[PDB]
Amino acid sequence: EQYCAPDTDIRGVDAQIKNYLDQIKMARAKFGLENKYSLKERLSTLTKELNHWRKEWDDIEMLMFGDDAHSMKKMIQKIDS
Amino acid sequence: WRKEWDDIEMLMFGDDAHSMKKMIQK
Amino acid sequence: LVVTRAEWEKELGTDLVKFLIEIYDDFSKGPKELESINASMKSDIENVRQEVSSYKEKWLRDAEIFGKITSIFKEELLKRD
Numbered sequence: 001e002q003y004c005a006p007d008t009d010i011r012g013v014d015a016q017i018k019n020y021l022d023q024i025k026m027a028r029a030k031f032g033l034e035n036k037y038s039l040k041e042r043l044s045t046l047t048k049e050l051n052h053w054r055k056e057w058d059d060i061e062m063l064m065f066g067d068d069a070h071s072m073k074k075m076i077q078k079i080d081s
Numbered sequence: 082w083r084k085e086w087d088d089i090e091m092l093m094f095g096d097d098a099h100s101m102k103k104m105i106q107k
Numbered sequence: 108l109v110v111t112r113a114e115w116e117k118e119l120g121t122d123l124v125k126f127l128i129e130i131y132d133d134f135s136k137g138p139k140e141l142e143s144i145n146a147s148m149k150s151d152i153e154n155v156r157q158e159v160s161s162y163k164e165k166w167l168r169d170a171e172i173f174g175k176i177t178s179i180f181k182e183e184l185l186k187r188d
Contacts, residue, residue: 028138029130030119035145036133037126042152045159052162055105059169062102062176065095072088079085096183103180106173 002013108131111117116124136144 024138025134026118028134028136028141029132030115031138031141031145032134032136033119033127033130033132034123035141035148037123039148039152042155046155049155049159049162052159052166056162056165056169058102059172062099063172066175066179069092069095072092076085079082093186096179096186099176099180099183103173103176106170 002008002016003010111119111130115127115130119127
C-alpha cells in the first residue's frame with residue numbers, strides 16, 4: 001500500500017521490498033534446514049531403537065526357545081517309553 | 082533316534098548362543 | 108548458496124553449526140507450512156525419544172529374561188566342565 005501513498009518516493013519502497021524478500025528466504029531456509037537434518041538425527045536414533053527392539057524380540061525368542069526346550073523334555077520323557 | 086540326537090545338539094548350540102547373548106546384555 | 112556470516116548461527120542456532128560447517132538448501136515450501144511441520148516434526152522427534160525410552164524398558168525386560176537365562180547359563184558352564 002505504500003507505493004500509491006501521496007508523499008512516498010518509489011525508490012525507498014523498492015528498497016523495502018528487497019529487504020522483505022531476503023527476510024522471507026532466511027526464515028523459511030532456517031526452518032527447513034533444521035526440520036529435515038534434526039529429524040534425520042532423530043531417525044538415526046530410531047534405527048538404534050529398532051536394533052534395541054530386535055534385541056528385545058531375540059530375548060522373547062530365547063524365552064520361547066526355553067518353552068521349546070520344555071516341550072523337548074516332555075518328548076524325551078515320552079522317547080523314554 | 083538320529084533326529085533326537087540332532088535336537089540335543091541344537092540345544093547345545095542354543096546354550097552356546099546363550100553365552101553370546103549374555104555378553105551382548107553386558 | 109549464501110553465507111550465514113555468524114548470522115546463520117545467530118538465527119539457525121549455534122549448536123547445529125557443526126555439520127553445516129564440516130548453502131543451496133530447499134526453501135520450496137511455504138515458511139508458514141514449514142513452521143507448522145516443524146511443530147509436528149519436533150513432536151515426532153519427542154515421540155522418537157519416547158520410543159527410545161520404551162526400547163530401554165524392553166532391554167530391561169530382556170535383562171530380567173537374561174537373569175532367568177542365568178540359571179540355564181550356570182547349567183551350561185557345568186556341562187562345559
